[PDB]
Amino acid sequence: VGRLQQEVTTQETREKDLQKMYSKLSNKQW
């Protein structure tokens, strides 16, 4: 269980980074 929570949390922080990018990117395409 502890390992899976780290694997999940690695993607959780990866997702926030990728969506801060996507907003920054799409707000430059506009």
Place this chain on the structure above:
Amino acid sequence: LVDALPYLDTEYNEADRQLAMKLVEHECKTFRPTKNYLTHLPVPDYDAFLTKCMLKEMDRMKKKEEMGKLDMSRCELPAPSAVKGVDRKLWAKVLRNAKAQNEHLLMRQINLELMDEYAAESYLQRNKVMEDLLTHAEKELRKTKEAVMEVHANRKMAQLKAGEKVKQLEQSWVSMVTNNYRMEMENRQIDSDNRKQIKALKL
């Protein structure tokens, strides 16, 4: 680190058992019991407490020889023949035996007669004690069976409760990997901006 949870890892089949052990066989074909695995246990002294006498008796049955037996022909007591009756001692040794058996038979009769008075009662009393041990042993057997079963209960109640978290976190992880990889392709495709920005800058 072994981390099996057999009430959650329920898929484990006999075909998996054969395959899994075949892998360890291809390893243990190449890895052998050279280490002294028993360093956490004492070495046994099989001859603890034994006397010099009992050692030789162990070594007899260790070499697989039969035990000695008492000769019991003294109860039948053959008469001597004509060629041994010249030995006066060898005649006395017959009579003295016949006197000894007379008293063994007398004491046997006294034992049997007392046994006829009290064996039936004492055997009945013996069984009544022995019966109690059996019921009390079956009580202990039943009591310990439930305790073993209770441990299986506490294991399943733990493994299943953990099995939900494993199933949620696994399902969550796989859903984000596919979603996050998708976003990585989008953020590449939206760098078409770099194309339009150049063309608009030349204009």
Place this chain on the structure above:
Amino acid sequence: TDISLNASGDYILSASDDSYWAFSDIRSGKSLCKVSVEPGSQIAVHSIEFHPDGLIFGTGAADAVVKIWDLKNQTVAAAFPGHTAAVRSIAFSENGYYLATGSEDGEVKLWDLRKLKNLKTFANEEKQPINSLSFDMTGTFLGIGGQKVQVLHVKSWSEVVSLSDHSGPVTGVRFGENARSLVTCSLDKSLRVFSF
């Protein structure tokens, strides 16, 4: 962490703290094969050896690994662990029907190279660190030590002498011809030679 020489002399065999082993030609410099023992972790391999029959030699690594290698297939072939802790040295005899191993968990043992089983053990009261091992020229004596030094006559398997002239742990051990000399380096900041 360790290196060893092919009996033909032209080729170098090697192991490292990265869980990998590598093998190369000395005479041209070309690497010839390399594998991860187990990839995906930085794990201490800390010995490697070559055995002059050609093969059936191995590596020692962190979690009491002592793996002989099926060199064609990049997998284990045999093993001689005897420890819970890592193994600092592995030595074959000339004919490879004796081998000895030891570790800082406090014992040294003699090994059936021919059948992959234990034969004999050296044991001691204190379980002191053992830092190196060496057969003699022939395999009839075995120096044992770390914080202190001792030598055994293996053909009788009895302890012979105890040496305390070092003022610190020993780091590497060799024996001379006919077991008549012993060569040692130590944390006492000297190199010291023993003989009779």
Place this chain on the structure above:
Amino acid sequence: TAQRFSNLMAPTMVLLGHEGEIYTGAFSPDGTCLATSGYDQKIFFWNVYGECENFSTIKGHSGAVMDLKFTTDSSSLVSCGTDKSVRVWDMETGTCARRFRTHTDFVNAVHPSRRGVTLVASASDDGTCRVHDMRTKEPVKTYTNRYQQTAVTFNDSSDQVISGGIDNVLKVWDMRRDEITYTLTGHRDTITGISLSPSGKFIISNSMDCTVRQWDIRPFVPGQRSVGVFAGHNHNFEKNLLKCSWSPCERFITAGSSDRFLYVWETLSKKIVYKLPGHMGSVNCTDFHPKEPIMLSCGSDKRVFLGEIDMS
């Protein structure tokens, strides 16, 4: 003896002193106190622990306080009402720090920006969302929608304003574009409250259609933004702006209900986990304590109920 889950003085506490329908209630983010108000126009403060004494009572609105939120640092309370005004109340002073006198009709909902400069989103019966910056009298943004707006929130980055109203569709206004970048369509009837998840990924939105719909408000979503639908609660003929709120761990969701029951749903399964009785009228506002498993519920019955729940 019985299990306990919090430092509450009893597993359920009943807080009494309001004089009218309690439309709104919120915990301080530090967990020390909670603030509640409604048709009686006074704002009552209560400690969460011990005797839960009503240690302060702000007054000043000339109308019902429709909605009431703490700023994230807990240093100020934002409140808005039928006096067409948003007010920011300084906690240490107990005083009106600012009075955004610029709406032209009742203000139905208010939400302070989560971080950065303090901005106050507000939605009103004039049809406009407005974002007010503490440093200026004039609003930063005015987003005129055509129909009365009843609920508002920022997104977590505080750069989109999400609002809903009589048109049932939620608008999402992008504050750098000044356009509706997308709308969330699915409610059958007017929205009564919107609340933003702690992580900011999701919003819930309560409506007079007696459903709560969970929406994915993340910048990229690979498909439909409707995540799921919760049901069980009811909206009666009083047409109160029944609020909604998030558990601080996001595993649970609440909404106000006219059926007297305090509803909790589990976010993942959508099952009702609690349907606690005890109110005698519309449970207008519901909130979770930010650090400890405690439920707030505010009734039309002038009662506030505090109680433990097993947040397993």
Place this chain on the structure above:
Amino acid sequence: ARQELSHSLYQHDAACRVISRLSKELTAAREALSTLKPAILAKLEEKSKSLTAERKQRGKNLPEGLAKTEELAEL
């Protein structure tokens, strides 16, 4: 019982060699997903095909000049 205990612990420790290899190989496989972005040896066998069995032919005895147990005691 002491024979079987040694073999099971051996078979247990032999299985842990397999768990260790696969667990890291699973971990490296999942790590890719977690970060996914768009010949003399044979002659050595030949020599091994005598010397591991041949060398009795020459090593018939231990050397005569090798130190005796009583001599190395003077180290």
Place this chain on the structure above:
Amino acid sequence: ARQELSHSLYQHDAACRVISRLSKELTAAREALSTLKP
């Protein structure tokens, strides 16, 4: 010794269950990569 043997036999049995399970997971993860990079 019989107690220790019993404990060793179940630990060995659990170890073989892991070797099954890690082999199942390892192939599933490899199929997840082939579902996304190709």
